[PDB]
Amino acid sequence: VNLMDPALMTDPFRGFSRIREEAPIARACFPGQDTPIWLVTRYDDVKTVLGEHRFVNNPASIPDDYVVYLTDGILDLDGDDHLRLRRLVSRAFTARRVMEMRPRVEEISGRLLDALPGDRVVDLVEEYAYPLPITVICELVGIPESDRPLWREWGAKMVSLSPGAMAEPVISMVDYIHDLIPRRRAAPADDLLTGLIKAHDDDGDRFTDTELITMVLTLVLAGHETTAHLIGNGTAALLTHPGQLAMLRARPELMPRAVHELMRWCGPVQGTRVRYAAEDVELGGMTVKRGEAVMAVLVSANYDPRRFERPDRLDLTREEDGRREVHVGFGHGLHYCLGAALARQEGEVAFAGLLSRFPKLRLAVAPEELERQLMPASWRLASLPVLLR
């Protein structure tokens, strides 16, 4: 009764909100459906689904030599295997590291912004939103500065090559990380790669080299395009909302709350990967059967009027306390985004940077003319043309 392609893609906000209201647990129909898929759209039900341990991400619960790096990543694991990797990665990817990243993200962002020209239209997606978060992950991980252009190029190729060729930069990145790990282990420094290498549980358990390569690749893949589109989408939102933008410039302490609202209103991830029922589960007055799939819809949860009053309004002041996170744009439960604090920091830094350097920052086309890169479960611009001066 629900089919995923037609004009849902163009307006997922109205499309999934109508569904939320009329059919809060609905069947979704996709070609090659190896099971029934249940679409879950209410805020409370999306949190129920994402917090439920009976839902698993792997139904079990590129050369052949590279396959592991793409299949055993943290988001693909459940139960005890997940518990272990999450515990291990949390010993290295710490609060201290995130706090210490702030001035580094400020310097990186500033150097990018400072090189942008005033004498032509600037594409903020290609020229800033994409290079920043890959560079930030380079800095976090400790990729040698000399090789950051190479990493940005691999990142750019991952987004722009055909799907028959997208493997090449992935494999090259793997090879790079494989080579770098023993170097960093022989020459340790205060960076996240060292942190990962040296992390160990109190009983001695620790990452294998395979797991270290997989984890590094995961952070890049999970953190590059997502963060890019938070920056692009949030900037476009601000530049089309002059009253909210003026408030934000007048009250820059609003930035953390402003980022929460931009995530709720136009965050780039609109659905999570499919969950599978490990056993029968009662959910909002029905029963999901063992083996059936469930797709949590973040965008409809984040626009749910049961939770957010006038949810269609972009209100940067909506949440009073920048410490509270009410939206599900970073997910929920055991797979809640590992990078959320870093991503929110990149957003705060990016939006503050843009506003501070460019009082005359403005869109260079009417918003109806922006091109969305249509893509399942995503909300992303193809480009963001602006004038800086």
Binding site for ligand HEM (CB under 6 A): 74-75, 86, 218-219, 222-223, 226-227, 230, 267-269, 272-273, 329-331, 335, 337-339, 342-343
378 binds, among Ca ion, ligand HEM, none (CB under 5 to 8 A by kind): Ca ion
Rounded to whole angstroms, what are the CA distances from 56 to 45, 62, 287, 335?
16, 25, 16, 10
d(CA 156, CA 198): 31
In whole angstroms, the minimum distance from the beta carbon of 30 to ligand HEM comes to 17
Contact 288/5 with Cβ under 8 angstroms? no
Annotated binding residue 273: yes
Contact 193/183 with Cβ under 8 angstroms? no
In whole angstroms, the minimum distance from the beta carbon of 379 to Ca ion comes to 8
In whole angstroms, the minimum distance from the beta carbon of 345 to ligand HEM comes to 8
Annotated binding residue 185: no
In whole angstroms, the minimum distance from the beta carbon of 37 to ligand HEM comes to 15
d(CA 174, CA 217): 7
Pick the closer one to ligand HEM by CB: 200 or 273: 273
Closest by CA position to 211, among listed 234, 181, 187: 181
15 binds, among ligand HEM, Ca ion, none (CB under 5 to 8 A by kind): none
Candidates 46-54, 138-146, 299-307, 375-383; binding stretch for Ca ion (CB under 5 A)? 375-383
If one asks whether residue 270 binds Ca ion (CB under 5 A), the answer comes out as: no
If one asks whether residue 378 binds Ca ion (CB under 5 A), the answer comes out as: yes
Using CA of residue 154, residue 156, residue 157, residue 159, what is the dihedral sign?
positive
Residues in the chain: 389
Annotated binding residue 337: yes
If one asks whether residue 233 binds Ca ion (CB under 5 A), the answer comes out as: no
* Conformation bin of residue 40: beta by default, left when phi > 0, alpha when psi is -120 to 50: beta
Residue 38, SS3 per DSSP:
strand
In whole angstroms, the minimum distance from the beta carbon of 146 to ligand HEM comes to 23
Candidates 20-28, 78-86, 231-239, 374-382; binding stretch for Ca ion (CB under 5 A)? 374-382
Pick the closer one to ligand HEM by CB: 274 or 355: 274
Residue 95, SS3 per DSSP:
helix
Pick the closer one to Ca ion by CB: 26 or 221: 221
Residue partners of 204: CB distance under 8 A and separation at least 6: none
Rounded to whole angstroms, what are the CA distances from 312 to 14, 17, 177, 325?
9, 10, 43, 18
Annotated binding residue 82: yes
The closest residue (CB) to ligand HEM is 339
In whole angstroms, the minimum distance from the beta carbon of 286 to ligand HEM comes to 22
Residue 382 amino acid letter: A
d(CA 296, CA 299): 9
Which residues make up the interface to Ca ion (CB under 5 A)? 378
Binding residues: 82, 86, 273, 275, 337
Binding residues for heme b: 82, 86, 273, 275, 337
